[PDB]
Amino acid sequence: VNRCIFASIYKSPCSPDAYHDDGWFICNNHLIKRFKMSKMVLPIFDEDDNQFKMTIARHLVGNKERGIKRILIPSATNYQDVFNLNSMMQAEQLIFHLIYNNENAVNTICDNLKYTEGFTSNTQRVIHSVYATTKSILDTTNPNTFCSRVSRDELRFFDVTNARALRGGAGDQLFNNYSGFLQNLIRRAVAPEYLQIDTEELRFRNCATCIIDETGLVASVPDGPELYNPIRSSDIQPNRLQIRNVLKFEGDTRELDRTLSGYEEYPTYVPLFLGYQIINSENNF
């Protein structure tokens, strides 16, 4: 029932909603595991017919983190060690090699398994049935294939009008070269900053949330210091000492919240937007 790649595979506390028809193909549990993002919803409407309960996602990167830590989603470039798959189970390594089209590693794996008794006797069924199942996701994505059943009446853009950026534009090449299911996930996560409509156009946020670079997706504002964001810290080693500094302000008199709590509050979290989307006024045909 689950579509989660991890659920395709010890225990996974897979999100129950991964059993419930939304083709993220991954639980938020594992979006945390490897990427520290949360899937989310944005209902929108004129008259609360609410046709447009669009999916979105937010990161949980720490505001003081720099370098690789800001990369939300690496490109194939250095992905091997951005993920450190070498630390990971062979199943995980195989999955990520499939995603990143590392068929050379796939071959190497199959060769190494070849003479192992654990491959000959058993588990070959497991490996290849799981592989087929996973590939079914590719076969349900990638608009170039899958009955061209990805089309879905609307067309998306990302690298659009990067404020004061110089005349140019790039990285959609790499976007397309990434597995199409990844691109669908990106569409699910990042709503466009603008939408074209048959009649008109609409705007959702004033200023840019994120950037895509050749290295991968990177959380940055266009300019200045990164907007302050404490981690929620609600969720996740002892074999060695682990340490962190943190700056805390240790307030008091907070029971004034007896008064304050009576009034409504506003979110403080991290929606991500990039680029346009377009509903065609007329079919090209």
What x-and-dash track marks residues 21-50 binding Zn ion by CB under 5 A? Answer: ------x--x--------------------
Which residues does 188 contact at the CB level (< 8 Å), separation at least 6? Answer: 24, 39, 55, 56, 57
Torsion sign, CA atoms 64, 158, 178, 214: negative
Which residues does 19 contact at the CB level (< 8 Å), separation at least 6? Answer: 1, 2, 3, 7
Among 30-38, 195-203, 231-239, 245-253, which window interacts with another protein (CB under 8 A)? 195-203
State which residue, 55 or 119, has the beta carbon closest to its own copies: 55
Relative to beta strand 154-156, strand 276-279 is: antiparallel
The size of the chain, in residues, is: 285
Among 3, 6, 102, 195, binds Zn ion (CB under 5 A): 6
User: For another protein, how many residues bind (rule: CB under 8 A)?
Assistant: 25
Question: Within 13 Å and on the Cβ side, how many CA atoms surround 164?
Answer: 3
Decide which of another protein, its own copies, Zn ion, none touches 4; Cβ closer than 5 to 8 Å per partner kind: Zn ion
Decide which of its own copies, another protein, Zn ion, none touches 169; Cβ closer than 5 to 8 Å per partner kind: another protein
Question: Within 13 Å and on the Cβ side, how many CA atoms surround 137?
Answer: 24
Decide which of another protein, Zn ion, its own copies, none touches 30; Cβ closer than 5 to 8 Å per partner kind: Zn ion
Contact residues: Zn ion, CB under 5 A = 4, 6-7, 14, 27, 30
Contact residues: another protein, CB under 8 A = 155, 157, 159-162, 164, 166-170, 172-173, 196, 200-201, 223-225, 276, 278, 280-281, 284
